[PDB]
Amino acid sequence: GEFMLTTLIYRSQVHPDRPPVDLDALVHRASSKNLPLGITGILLFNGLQFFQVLEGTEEALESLFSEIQSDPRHRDVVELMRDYSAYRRFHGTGMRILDLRLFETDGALEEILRFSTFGVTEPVNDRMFRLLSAFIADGGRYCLPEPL
Ligand SMILES: Cc1cc2nc3c(=O)[nH]c(=O)nc-3n(C[C@H](O)[C@H](O)[C@H](O)COP(=O)(O)O)c2cc1C
Numbered sequence: 104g105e106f107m108l109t110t111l112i113y114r115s116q117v118h119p120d121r122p123p124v125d126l127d128a129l130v131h132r133a134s135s136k137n138l139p140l141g142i143t144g145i146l147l148f149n150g151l152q153f154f155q156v157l158e159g160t161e162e163a164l165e166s167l168f169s170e171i172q173s174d175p176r177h178r179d180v181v182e183l184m185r186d187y188s189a190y191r192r193f194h195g196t197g198m199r200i201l202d203l204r205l206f207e208t209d210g211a212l213e214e215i216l217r218f219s220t221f222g223v224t225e226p227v228n229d230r231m232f233r234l235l236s237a238f239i240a241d242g243g244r245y246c247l248p249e250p251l
Contacts, residue, residue: 108188111164115180134198146200154238
C-alpha cells in the first residue's frame with residue numbers, strides 16, 4: 104500500500120585514531136540502496152562524526168538506521184530525529200555525504216542548499232534542519248557560548 108513519508112535523522116562518530124573515511128565510496132554504496140528503496144537524504148563528516156538526514160518511509164528509516172548502528176566504522180550513532188512527513192526535500196539525491204572538513208558552518212550548509220532544492224514551507228522550524236545546521240554549526244560539543 105501507499106504509506107506516508109517520514110524523516111529519520113541520526114549522528115555517529117568515527118575512528119579518532121584510525122585514518123579518514125571513504126566518504127566517496129561510503130555514500131556511493133548508500134545511495135545505490137536508498138534510491139531503489141525510495142529513501143533520500145544527505146550525510147556529513149567533520150573528522151569525528153557522521154550526520155545523516157534520512158527522509159522516506161518510516162519502515163525504511165528504522166531498518167536503515169538500524170543497519171547503520173550495526174556498522175563498525177562510526178560508533179556513537181544516535182537517533183537524532185524521526186518525524187512524520189508527506190514530501191521529499193531532496194528530490195533526486197538519494198545519499199550525499201558532506202566532508203565538512205572541506206567547508207564550514209555557512210559553507211557546508213550552503214552545499215546542502217545548492218543541491219537540496221529545499222522548497223518546503225520553511226527550513227526555519229524544520230525539525231531536520233534543526234539537526235542539520237546543528238552539526239554544521241557545532242559538529243559536536245560546542246564551546247562558543249559561556250566561556251571560562
Ligand atoms: C558511516 C556510514 C554511513 C552509512 N549510511 C548509509 C545510509 O544512509 N544508507 C545505506 O543504505 N547504507 C549506508 N551505509 C552502508 C553502506 O552504504 C555500505 O553498505 C557499506 O559501505 C559496505 O557495503 P557492502 O557490505 O555491501 O560492501 C553506511 C555505512 C557507513 C560506514
